[model samples]
Target: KRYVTDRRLAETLAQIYLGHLLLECNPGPGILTQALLEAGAKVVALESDKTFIPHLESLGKNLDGKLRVIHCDFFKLDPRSGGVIKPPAMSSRGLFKNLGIEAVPWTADIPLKVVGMFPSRGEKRALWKLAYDLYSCTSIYKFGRIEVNMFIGEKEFQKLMADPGNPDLYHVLSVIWQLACEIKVLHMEPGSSGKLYLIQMIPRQNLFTKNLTPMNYNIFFHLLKHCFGRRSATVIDHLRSLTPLDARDILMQIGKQEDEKVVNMHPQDFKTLFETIERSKDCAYKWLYDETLEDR
Candidate 1:
């Protein structure tokens, strides 16, 4: 039987990232946030679900300034907009593809279509609130893909009175996507002068109650290859060729080097990278599973 709810697994991941040992907790309580903090990383927690707010707040207090909690819809709040929280209006017409692609809206709003003009005064206010609620809380580095607005928030509270298609909002959504695209580009093409680092800290299998780990590792490497344009085979071969001393020496050298300056990556680059990954997967499936019954 697969012991799907193992607290030990959570503990292990936290340990790996935080570099300290800790006991397991049911519901994997505060595991991710605690571990990231212990690892010297700052964390911000966002959950719109009122039911979980108390628990998250308790955790935030215990974290001793290492973590902060924002009880708002992550998609609606814009961090760049400062502490001001506005609700984004829900667009019946899909303007931002990232939100649609991620299926976030399906969970939040009713679908509709309109002439694509600015909403009525009430409607505009509602949308502004919704969008504000969604985008303003989280780190740009983490949920960098989705764009949130305030109109949806206003709509949720029955404050929306505007018709669909506010020109100002349309322009805002356009700019948000353009910004996301630029961020994606930087990640894909970190030119020779670029010095960014990619790090991974995952839980060990024993901590996960000994589930099949090879598959997890395989999937991770596959993602690396496809999403980041990394060469998995080459990385694997390099690792295999290294002696313990050589590996340690290289790691030391890397540690001694200062972290690279970050550049703005565009979202279009991310889309292209995903497309390449999908294409690769399709070809492999065609060769290996095309004739299998499961393929259908």
Candidate 2:
């Protein structure tokens, strides 16, 4: 059964992105696609499954340019390119012929919202990376913030928002998410099969005009990668392992002596330590791990 089979659910989700450009990923059978179009939204539906392409094409015909189907990998498509996949052919037909030869990429000028059902277990991490990739380009896109609304299983949602003190629930990605955006559960309901949650994520706002600088962003990004490798170890202990320095020395330099028992500290606490490292001008300190791990 599809996650959004009920008309009410589809209508509710469509309202969130109404009159906005939306990226609908893996829109099986175009259920939500129809709803979004009917709700006065333009949709760029990405479906890799060949079997569903024709179904989406038919849906597009009825929407009168409201829906466009792109048959390719969403991750490979550059958002800046405006959704054009390769060059347009003169002989193109159907929706492509009417819309124009080239697939119109989502322009940065338009406010774009990403909406999708819960990805399969295998695609969950890839989805997270995709969201991060799009959000990272917010400056180029000229959007104050890119919002992602997704349907996720309750158990998975718990882990995503887990406190760092709960080692069993905390993960490296969890810390990365907390530092990057403000995530909130929008709605929760019991499905016929299990519990489902609608969650929204937006870039974190600043306090006292303190914003995330490029240097601090990279430092926090790297710090999560470094510390979470040893989730059970204290933050100082992990830092010591990465650098040729004593745990106490690192903590003292960061003015985190009060947090010497960092192993039990929450992920929010680690953010402070990461900021300290960015402020310190000690050339001797270096990240032991490759900084480009996220790229891989």
Candidate 3:
């Protein structure tokens, strides 16, 4: 419901917006959209509300401007599963056809930048959905590590970048999210952007590795979720049933004592422990599976 109608505010944000391609969502009146354009950034206006589309769409009516307006919300661009969808769904395949940009390698510079305010509704659910898509490299990220400059809720921003020591703020998503993206706070002005914080999140170039291959990321997600279920317990306690090899061996190799609390362990330490188990020669299958997990 918030709009960045201030010209000077938009101009300031446009500093980092220069020379980049931005998808501005719910751009109610094109205030920020035009500012980004004047700063040398190419823009795509995604207006879901019809009331303001009349004026916004005119930018490209003559086909002489750098800004293009699409009558769809950014959240509707990609569907998570097969389903019957109609108008305004804006499938990524169809949208990408209009913008002739090629998918780049994961290590390449950002192919695009998405700058917008997360809708006030479904705010938390939207973030969790985005975290999964980012971790799995699906949805928009299938093209590459697209940079994100978004305005998110004050407390919401803290949780994504929270460390293990911040137990109340740190959770499963925090672990997987930090592992997948390099999250940074760009700007914060309570009076300027309301109570929201602007942040940039770039998918890590080293996301894939021998210990944590993309193919095995699902297991990593499950590992994080399960361990966090008993957040305060010793990691080895929860880890014992996760792997067939001695849990003690895994911790020892990671240079941790049996007293290592799951809540106190560093986020990177979790990755190190997982990689140790995955790389173990003791069992070709690193994790011990439940009989229930054998099938669908």
Clashing pairs in 3: none
Off by over 4 Å in 1: 1-5, 15-29, 38-40, 75-296
Better of 2 and 3 by TM-score: 3
Candidate 2 regions off by >4 Å? 1-3, 75-110, 131-144, 164-167, 205-219, 244-255, 258-263, 282-285, 290-296
lDDT of candidate model 1 versus the reference = 0.29
Candidate 2 lDDT over residue span 1-296, tens digit each = 23466777778777765635677867877777888888778788867566888988998887755677877444434443254445321112233334443332233222446677666464356545544553344221224345667778876777778874566877666666676567887767678777888787665553001334532355556666666666666677677655544556657765666345534556666666655554455566554655554521
lDDT of 1 by residue, 1-296 (tens): 01113345434444433341111111123444455455554444444445655765676676654555544443333433454434331221232232232232212331211101112243334233333322331232122223221112222222111111232122222222232222111011122333221111111112111221222222222322232232222322232232222323332333322221111112222233223333333232211111111100
- Please, what are the lDDT tens digits per residue for candidate 3 over residues 70-128? 77877766766656275766676667668775678888999988888877666666776
Clashes of each: 75, 3, 0
Candidate 2 lDDT for residue 166? 65
* Predicted structure 3: lDDT: 0.76
Q: Which ten residues in a row have the lowest lDDT in candidate 1?
A: 287-296
Report every candidate's CA lDDT: 0.29, 0.59, 0.76
lDDT of 2: 0.59
| TM-scores for every predicted model | 0.25, 0.72, 0.89
